[PDB]
Design brief:
The structure is cut from a larger assembly and holds 4 copies of chain A. Chain A is mainly beta. Chain A is built from 3 helices and 26 strands. In chain A, strands 14, 21, 22, 23, 24, 25 and 26 form a 7-stranded antiparallel beta sheet that branches. A 6-stranded antiparallel beta sheet of chain A has the order 18-17-20-15-16-19, with no helix packed on it. The interface between A and C is large, with 68 and 70 residues. Chain C: GO terms for molecular function: identical protein binding. Chain C: InterPro entries: Calicivirus_coat, Calicivirus_coat_C, Rhv-like, Viral_coat. Chain C: Pfam families: Calici_coat, Calici_coat_C.
């Protein structure tokens, strides 16, 4: 049935107040395209009430409009949404799509309450799409490019529990797709220099094969993707950490030239640390100097050089003694004279002080417990999704064995995100790992806002380790935190 | 919904420039027939993004039009495509059919981008067909018979992953069919003598039972079809190699009268090779004289005769010594006088020099490593499809055991293709092996452009070896590289 | 919008340009494509009349310029207007005419004339003499003319419309200096005429087919990463940038092999993508000779290049790297002299002055003055001798030199650890390279005008030119002055595409 | 050519919903008045892209309107802007003014980009004033006095370099003046009791000459203005810290009567501090008692007194001891009897504990490093800006040598700011150090919100030290990010 709403006016409001009223190409006007937040999934893992997707009106709901968004600074108009479900005859269920007006705020709604808004309900079996108009309910004359604005939203919820019958293969998920096109009322407003506004920038990942990239914890080329041992779950690296917004975290630097390095003046007993610039490090600033190595379960030794002096020495460091207070810019000097050096991690050994034990590169070293100053550490991470695991980028590390350093994101990705500070829309970013030569999808992954990927392993023996390093990660769509990925690899 | 396109004009453009504007039979005008590239398959082996088929506008999309194509040299007009899917209630999924305008070029598109073109989406379950108009977007007044022209294309992709539920039988594939008919705007242009232009010739295989044909590596009648041992995968024969275009490769000749033969002048120590004509062989020309035997893992001996001399001798040849340099037209003469002879392979023995080992007819002999000249060898082959295996034609070879020579294509097929240099449309040619007496389909195979068949064996014990040699291979349709064949034979 | 100084310009300069009409008939716009294009996409009417500064919006005339010099070469297309350029990325094809307006207005004391000629598609590239330019429909104007000259760029077509490929040849507008520029009065040679080019589409102009917004390369804008210089690194060694520098009066041409990338994103020489491959080598030690391979362990090949990708390119230096190994707890030093006949990087063969057998991964980390020549000075501007394997094509990266009026090469330098105050110069920061490679943006025009700016205040600190081959140039103020006097907080901002001869303003402070 | 803008409505919109629509004195209605930031000069040294001026639509542009805003609580309307240049017929160069809509951002632009906005490009030779309409582009019906309200902006940049001919006197510069005036569209909205609303209050500094004032760190007359040595960059005092909003930060009090003083109970070993009222101090409310001296690298000592006891006892203090826990209200009693006294810093000496070394008044003493509590220190202030340096107010303090005590704001200023809590609009307050008698401007300064001044020193020796202490600081206007100060000091 039709929505319980009266038609909302378009440009007619902002005529005498906006500097310009700019029309759009009529070919976009009714061509239904997949919205950037165009995917979702329903599986028996979902419970009635789960929000499959939450959209908010704006040009960011259509790729074409989005591209134009970077050229104008305002907009007004209504859109049109179309939803599709790829179900089976075995999939019983109903979904509710409700329009939530601005000003209502956020609350936990029971499926019953979700009905109280103009809505549309559909059986997951339908072969045909569902159409819902997204009206531009306004309190103001028009909208500016600002995702802080409260616009009308479309919330899709599981109305009844998904109940698969038959030979119930819990690996079965109903694929959902969202598509939109602007109602002819739609109009952009003020013309503005392209791409300058950041609020309108699309999310982008560099078009470069994984192999040619490097590690973010140590200057090492990536050799393969890996998974944490069944034991490890939460991680807390300090380098190679960046938000999809492009905000650096922990001790993560922009360029590799700062990764896994330290600079300071040796007192022949203790080394006073300084930023690579030579600038004074400050304990409140962070956990340690920017670029300072974060290899935990290790007894690492860096190669130290000096300016104006022909020399190369080895500084063996154990991260256990109380003399190891990087947080206060003071560490040991096992056997180094005075002066200032520049060290680069280039050789790791199994931790000495614990008990002469095994290497656990998944850990983070202890930064002096300086309680008088601000121990501003980088938060931990873990897979929030359905049977997802953290995906790591690994490079073989030189040492007394088969060591391979795991990191969250390649340094180049970090460098890219920092430049294009593209706002993150949605709870997660669905990525498709594609082979550049064929364009075939090798896998499906999810990049979370905090800056880390996850995936679903086909089996304990299976995973991304089995995939070639020629692929490139391509952004496909923004998705919900609870999107269920297709398992990667081959189990046998 | 309707396509996001404006109607494109027909003949009205090329009136004042083409010599003639020729109309077609109105009965063809709206009769939906299966296009020559009328088949495709979707299976869980496919990944969203896979191109199920790629069509390009032209009379070659309709059998009737195609037949007329051989009579005119130009065309203009729009067509109409109709797609069908034979799915189940267990098959969940969606496909995208998009129209790609000329000039766009080729790129790897994510399912999201595929949506940005005028498109049509369908659930794999539909009982009804899908219709899409293929407009003749033109930059020029009209089109000439040239498949190098850039015309509008229709690309079908898997929009969402195919997810079979229930008692998941991975042998289940959704059968797809494409059909077309010309929009009344369609018109052929200049009348031209029939079949003369090659660009318009249909692909054809000789209507002859397999049994009556011969081998392409040795003058032996075909006795059965076979499969490479689980160990063998890639092959590199040099004789019996021809493209579907009709281009001969390696040392492959047109007639059997040149197969497995050699001619040259014996120096009582070394035999200098020449082409069977008597013409001088040239090392840059190829790997060895045209017709020169390619039986690898063998210690073969040919029967040598002479002109103007009553004699028949036996020249036993081991393909291991450094004296074996066919590439330079110089080989051994184990015990032959001087003069010129003509030898025909007629008896093989297990290889002597390796260690007195077993016969491996799947190999190719070593042609002298002449690095100063061009060792122009014929590339290797292997099954590109889903669990496909190379199909071979075998004839029993005379020798000290149960030997059967495997070859890629019967010589007669080669002779045929060479004559009718029919352009290959599509990634592969779907063939149906039919019993001439009943017309019943015995099997389904794929002939690839390079000149070799493949198939899917029902089981390790099953395969084409179990099929009668009375059948004839009939061309059915051009298909994608990733078309999935129905397994052949019977497993028990 | 436009306010020419007519009111107060006295009558020393001509207001409007008096010139004979263009010897050319009007060309049709969209009317052509209407019947065969899949769509005819209209554009925002506000763009239709705004004369905006084209991406190739600047040029300069100076007394150094000689008649015949090309001030700008415009080829018809959406890439001539910033708005259109952005929309280009969304459509496949176009048809229509453009309205061009060149702006001049030199002092009443300057004299000189330029000539603009329209060249038909299909003519090809040829070096035209000023007299040849006359043969094409042209317009001539005095540099003093107040009001901007308007020239219609007609879309001469052989076909119904255009597509976004390289198979297309459109009409061009070449502007050259007609007569030498000469300022009278108290000639301040700092005086050059600053020209501006603005365009807006004629209402005939239309885009054609809607297409996925970014996919096509022809439409991609040239962009530089928005990152302060200090945060970036060197390309010849994994060292952070310290400051910019100039080659000594003596040094002119350079041939670095690492840290070389075309503005289109084409990697040249041994230049790798990531720093993880910079100044490193991998190979198997034979205790006497080390057999090189790519860092991937993959086999190097003499036809591939001068040396393995990432192989250090420091010339006048006696460098020694730090070598490590997998599975073997060790760290050794490899002292290398680039002079010996045993130093044949081009053949994957080098010395081993004291290294046991095995396979290592070395990182340049310590350099010293070249031993073998005469125990003399360090010249980092040089490139080492790559084995002159006569039996293999030594595919080297070409040399670069400043083509502009009194321009010099600009280098990015980082201090290198050694027996003194050394600083390694490179052409581009590694990250810039990484960026260009990703965004293979077509380069339009002979050079890119850049403005070095302080991100905080937005103050223009310097003016530079980036050339296609991948290198910057600038005009140093005094001999003592130059880019070394500038802070490393700035970022490079693309201003407009320019001709080879755009004359830059001297950088730094001379005293 | 015209301006790329449609005219925007004035009061028309307000009428319907504003309570009143108040007219303006017609004499103001079209009288062009110079704007606060109405001056700029174009020297041949400027490069195209340099920003000449920045404007924001608002009553603040016109002193008359401004004075009126304090009587009404809303406004809507359009102003008219006139730019006037002073040049010969012997010059050349163009300027460009771009109209930037509200809701864009403050990111820097290229002259090319400036063209993308509705703009006006004028040639320097123009005689007549350039009129540009400052239109009220609104998102709402009208404006309520808020800082949240973003208005139309006008940015002016040099388009083409100034090239003067003739016997070129490089002292030659083209001066520019900016003037505005409302248009009949403009109207104030609701009559509200004058000066009661905070939002309308103008920023003000006391009209008193520097000399007659005092330091905010110690009760001492200001004797000179100084700058931190090239070595001292970041500063962090705790007294004499006050935001322009009128918010007291750190231990900063209002009256000098609480400056550099402490009151507490002497345990004969440790002194237990309290606020001057005899009220209990609390480690959580702040890092130390309000008024507690913040002199860093100094071995200072007060003169204590007590009520009901005729006594004066010198109390010596070292800021290094672990007994010095000001944050916990516990300090040393190096030789003091028990009781409760009131001490006032009156004599300073070089710090004893470091090594009996020199005095550093730029430093801040150590306030007991308590981890349990929140040592909420007042954040460090550094000079934000290209070449801007921190300005200090100094007074000579008694001790064994020359002790010039630095200060950020004269206490009197602080007292004033708290009284008139004037909201801070903009980034910085342009100030003029004027000689009261002559009414002559002696220097151009910048006042930042956090509570401090900056300036651009002329020569290495030249600066504020070369200025007389008879001047008064006068507020000019709220400046932008782009505003570059005029170098202060007498350089020759």
């Amino acid at each position: 049935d039709p929505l319980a709403m009266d038609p909302v006016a378009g440009s007619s409001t902002a005529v005498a107040t906006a500097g310009q009223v700019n029309p759009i190409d009529p070919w976009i006007i009714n061509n239904f395209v997949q919205a950037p937040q165009g995917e979702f999934t329903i599986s028996p893992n979902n419970t009635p009430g789960d929000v499959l997707f939450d959209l908010s009106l704006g040009p960011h709901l259509n790729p074409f409009l989005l591209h134009l968004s970077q050229m104008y600074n305002g907009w007004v108009g209504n859109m049109r949404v179309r939803i599709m479900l790829a179900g089976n005859a075995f999939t019983a269920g109903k979904i509710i799509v409700s329009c939530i007006p601005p000003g209502f705020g956020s609350h936990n709604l029971t499926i019953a309450q979700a009905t109280l808004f103009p809505h549309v309900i559909a059986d997951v079996r339908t072969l045909d799409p569902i159409e819902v108009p997204l009206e531009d309910v306004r309190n103001v004359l028009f909208h500016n490019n600002d995702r802080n604005q409260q616009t009308m939203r479309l919330v899709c919820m599981l109305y009844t529990p998904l109940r698969t019958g038959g030979g119930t293969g819990d690996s079965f998920v109903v694929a959902g797709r969202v598509m939109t096109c602007p109602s002819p009322d739609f109009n952009f407003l003020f013309l503005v220099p392209p791409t300058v506004e950041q609020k309108t920038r699309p999310f982008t990942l560099p078009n470069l094969p994984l192999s040619s990239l490097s590690n973010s914890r140590a200057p090492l080329p990536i050799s393969s993707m890996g998974i944490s041992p069944d034991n490890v779950q939460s991680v807390q690296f300090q380098n190679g950490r960046c938000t999809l917004d492009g905000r650096l975290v922990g001790t993560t630097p922009v360029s590799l030239s700062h990764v896994a390095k330290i600079r300071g003046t040796s007192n022949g007993t203790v080394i006073n640390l300084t930023e690579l610039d030579g600038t004074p490090f400050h304990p409140f600033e962070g956990p340690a100097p920017i670029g300072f190595p974060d290899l935990g379960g290790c007894d690492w030794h860096i190669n130290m050089t000096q300016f104006g002096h022909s020399s190369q020495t080895q500084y063996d460091v154990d991260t256990t003694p109380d003399t190891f207070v990087p947080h206060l810019g003071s560490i040991q000097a096992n056997g180094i004279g005075s002066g200032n050096y520049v060290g680069v991690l280039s050789w790791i050994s199994p931790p000495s002080h614990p008990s002469g034990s095994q290497v656990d590169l998944w850990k983070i070293p202890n930064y002096g417990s300086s309680i008088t100053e601000a121990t501003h550490l980088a938060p931990s991470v873990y897979p929030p999704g359905f049977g997802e695991v953290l995906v790591f980028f690994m490079s073989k590390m030189p040492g007394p064995g088969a060591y391979n350093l795991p990191c969250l994101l390649p340094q180049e990705y970090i460098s890219h995100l920092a430049s294009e500070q593209a706002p993150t829309v949605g709870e997660a970013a669905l990525l498709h790992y594609v082979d550049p030569d064929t364009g075939r999808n090798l896998g499906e992954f999810k990049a979370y806002p905090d800056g880390f990927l996850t995936c679903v392993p086909n089996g304990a023996s299976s995973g991304p380790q089995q995939l070639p390093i020629n692929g490139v990660f391509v952004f496909v769509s923004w998705v919900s935190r609870f999107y269920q990925l297709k398992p990667v690899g081959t189990a046998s």
